[PDB]
Design a protein around this ligand. Structure first.
Ligand SMILES: NC(=O)c1ccc[n+]([C@@H]2O[C@H](COP(=O)([O-])OP(=O)(O)OC[C@H]3O[C@@H](n4cnc5c(N)ncnc54)[C@H](O)[C@@H]3O)[C@@H](O)[C@H]2O)c1
Ligand SMILES: NC(=O)c1ccc[n+]([C@@H]2O[C@H](COP(=O)([O-])OP(=O)(O)OC[C@H]3O[C@@H](n4cnc5c(N)ncnc54)[C@H](O)[C@@H]3O)[C@@H](O)[C@H]2O)c1
Ligand SMILES: O=c1ccn([C@@H]2O[C@H](COP(=O)(O)OP(=O)(O)O[C@H]3OC[C@@H](O)[C@H](O)[C@H]3O)[C@@H](O)[C@H]2O)c(=O)[nH]1
Ligand SMILES: O=c1ccn([C@@H]2O[C@H](COP(=O)(O)OP(=O)(O)O[C@H]3OC[C@@H](O)[C@H](O)[C@H]3O)[C@@H](O)[C@H]2O)c(=O)[nH]1
Lengths: 402, 402
């Protein structure tokens, strides 16, 4: 089968590689660097499995910037373009998904379009009315960055939407896509669910919102533990032995970050409009409150120091353990608040070459100097190469992961 | 060992039975009915395992109302009296725990006192200053009603507190109590944690608050599903296949009820005073909001009916599946709101003999008549004996449990 994938990020790339083993895949992007990298066997993102597959597997995969040439030839088109949350409109800016749908629909009259990009609840229905077709369905993605292909090889579950009154081709394609994902998985018993679009859209948003809920809770517990001078590890460990709570995804941080959790929680809150609820909105504010609290604790550790200048050394900007980006990294909001004061900020981030031209922070990638200059070292996740300056490191990290 | 247990409820009784297998237990209560029942081998509460143990196990257990005679002779005293949340003071009314501590301390100068009752964070420390002793420790209870002894035979974990500067007798007794609970368990690898009192107090409150959090979330998801006319089962099932969320404890209801979740969430919120947070308070308001929403949906189903009188038949008042009490039962708050209108309320509750003398609801325990008179049947958990009036039954129950 010839499949076109719109988007070369974590989602677009892992799906494209995943499906190129027994399908004829063409990935499309609007960045030449990414196309050239793919066509040469290189991943434009750090991913152990994607990297290994591009290099050692036999894949029928090619990249291009010629959208139309790719979409016209396709039997299925998977859209995995960006869907950022836009603060002005109070909603996801869906222009990058809409733009591809229009393009695909203008040069392809048979292909079903499968959206992998996280969208608002009610977007498929809305796109079907706007474009007057039923050839658009949603199949939520549950992958974690740094485990993008891994999570498609060993997925928790597979969900593809289609409506009761959809055409036989679209019902068949929805089923077919679901089974292409199932048979491509190396895991054996992957549950497959076919449900209505809005239901599938909701699943994605509610799943990520629950994960955000979890981090926020353990972060408010941690806020409480630090304020009452209690042993946070002892408390989290004690509540987590209840198998209904679990010992996973429960490591305190400066807040939930990354590309998805931040925006999806906001989207779900907007999709609620005026439906009754208090938790959904609290899940979003909790993150802000946790960030402010962290900044303030840092401010107090600082002022209690006798030094002509107060320097805060920020160790890493990565959004989670092992990450390769800083999207919505919680330490960035903390940094911002700190800047609202008179604190010199130095940042040690190997993965970064230069800070924005106007950034007041100073990038110091010589680790030795970094430690030398920092009065206090602030980091979201602790690292062993900080043992020699251990007593001036502030972090809420307990378990060394996530 | 001679152990005295203050309190004959779910907690006091299951611990007392649990420990009477190899210890000389004496349970104390201020209700003759409960003492007479225990001394004759009967459980004053529905509990399969407690019932079976009283009747078929060899137990060294006796009950009494003579507190002093029991506390003076004891080597350890376990306090499991009530700790209700008091709306006026905005806090747990700890008078029933305090009263036993004082009693025990006045006739016993060697016994360590172990509190199993859920208490405020900082209560042990507070009780130690008030009574000028260190002979008071906390060991949180994690049992579920209807599985009270079961949960002590197969506990998720065991936690007993003691402080670094406690006397050797109290450190030894804390350890000893922990091991009495471990060896009494039929489960093999039960994790044991010894931590500071405040840490242990927090574990209990944070654990129950998380469970309340979970129910509230799935209830707000359900509120959203009913309002947007979506398949709630399809959505919950889709998010629950993520092993990090899980397929457990996720069944929609009219709200979280029972004796513990309602009061513990309020207690934790009070223990936060002004420490920063938004989730903790939202977890409590969410329940109220969910209740109001449910009542309103019922009100709309009602008004859309042509009948001179509008009768709402409430099927059961039990607080959860298989429960034998109605403590903080969510359907009761729903009933209240309904009464705020002009709706005749009839209630079918076999376990109930008479409603309060002033209750405007009418108790109809003939199930046939109940169905005959009810315009709509409202129930927290559906039951098969309602199939013949299925189309007039309103419930958000999906999985038939919890
Ligand atoms: N990243 C995750 O962890 C994750 C997981 C599940 C779902 N999702 C969702 O999938 C979507 C994409 O996320 P991502 O992390 O892969 O993003 P990404 O930023 O890594 O990739 C987006 C890519 O789309 C390309 N692009 C933008 N417009 C295009 C267009 N009009 N035509 C073709 N290519 C275009 C960009 O060049 C970029 O390479 C988002 O909705 C995200 O919420 C993300
Ligand atoms: N019920 C649960 O699911 C559960 C689980 C874990 C912890 N807890 C906590 O344990 C405590 C007790 O809960 P419960 O459900 O067993 O309550 P319960 O109401 O079933 O039992 C309380 C008993 O204490 C007796 N009593 C009151 N004052 C007394 C006194 N001064 N001296 C002796 N006896 C007295 C009452 O007669 C009653 O029989 C509460 O703090 C509760 O929050 C309850
Ligand atoms: O215990 C934890 C877990 C997570 N977090 C934070 O929460 C944020 C998200 O962490 P995740 O590991 O979920 O990382 P990702 O954002 O890559 O994945 C997430 O979004 C995409 C979804 O498809 C994934 O299912 C979801 O896990 C990170 O900033 C992480 O540091 C904590 O602070 N503590
Ligand atoms: O999925 C669920 C689970 C629970 N609930 C509700 O939440 C309330 C609590 O349910 P539980 O099964 O936890 O019952 P219990 O109150 O007996 O146990 C709870 O309190 C005492 C603690 O020690 C236990 O660990 C805790 O589970 C009930 O009203 C129940 O109906 C739901 O509505 N949906």
């Amino acid at each position: 089968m010839k499949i076109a994938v719109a988007g070369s990020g974590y989602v677009g790339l892992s799906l494209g590689v995943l499906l190129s083993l027994q399908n004829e895949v063409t990935i499309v992007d609007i960045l030449p660097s990414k196309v050239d990298k793919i066509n040469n066997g290189l991943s434009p993102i750090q991913d152990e499995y994607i990297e290994y597959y591009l290099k050692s597997k036999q894949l029928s995969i090619k990249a291009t910037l010629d959208s139309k040439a790719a979409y016209k030839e396709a039997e299925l088109v998977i859209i995995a373009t960006p869907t950022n949350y836009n603060s002005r409109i109070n909603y996801f800016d869906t222009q990058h998904v809409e733009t591809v749908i229009k393009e695909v629909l203008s040069v392809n009259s048979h292909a079903t379009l499968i959206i992998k990009s996280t969208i608002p609840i009610g977007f498929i229905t809305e796109m079907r009315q706007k474009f007057q077709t039923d050839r658009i369905i949603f199949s939520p993605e549950f992958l974690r960055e740094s485990k993008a292909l891994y999570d498609n090889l060993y997925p928790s579950r597979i969900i593809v939407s289609c409506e009761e009154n959809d055409s036989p081709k679209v019902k068949a394609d929805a089923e077919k896509f679901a089974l292409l994902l199932k048979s491509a998985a190396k895991k054996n018993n992957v549950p497959v669910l076919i449900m209505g679009a809005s239901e599938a859209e909701a699943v994605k948003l509610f799943a990520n919102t629950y994960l955000a809920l979890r981090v926020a809770y353990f972060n408010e517990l941690d806020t409480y533990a630090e304020s009452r001078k209690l042993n946070s590890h002892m408390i989290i460990q004690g509540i987590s032995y209840d198998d209904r709570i679990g010992m996973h995804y429960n490591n305190p941080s400066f807040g939930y970050g990354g590309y998805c959790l931040p925006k999806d929680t906001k989207q779900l809150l907007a999709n609620y409009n005026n439906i009754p609820q208090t938790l959904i909105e609290a899940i979003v504010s909790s993150n802000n409150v946790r960030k402010s609290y962290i900044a303030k604790q840092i401010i107090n550790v600082l002022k209690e120091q006798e030094s002509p200048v107060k320097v805060v050394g920020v160790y890493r900007l990565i959004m989670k353990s092992n990450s390769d980006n800083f999207r919505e990294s919680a330490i960035k909001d903390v940094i911002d608040i700190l800047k609202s004061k008179d604190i010199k900020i130095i940042i040690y981030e190997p993965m970064l070459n230069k800070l924005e031209s106007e950034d007041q922070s100073v990038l110091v990638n010589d680790l030795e100097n970094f430690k030398k200059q920092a009065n206090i070292i602030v980091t979201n996740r602790y690292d062993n190469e900080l043992q020699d300056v251990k007593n001036k490191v502030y972090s809420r990290d307990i378990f060394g992961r996530d």
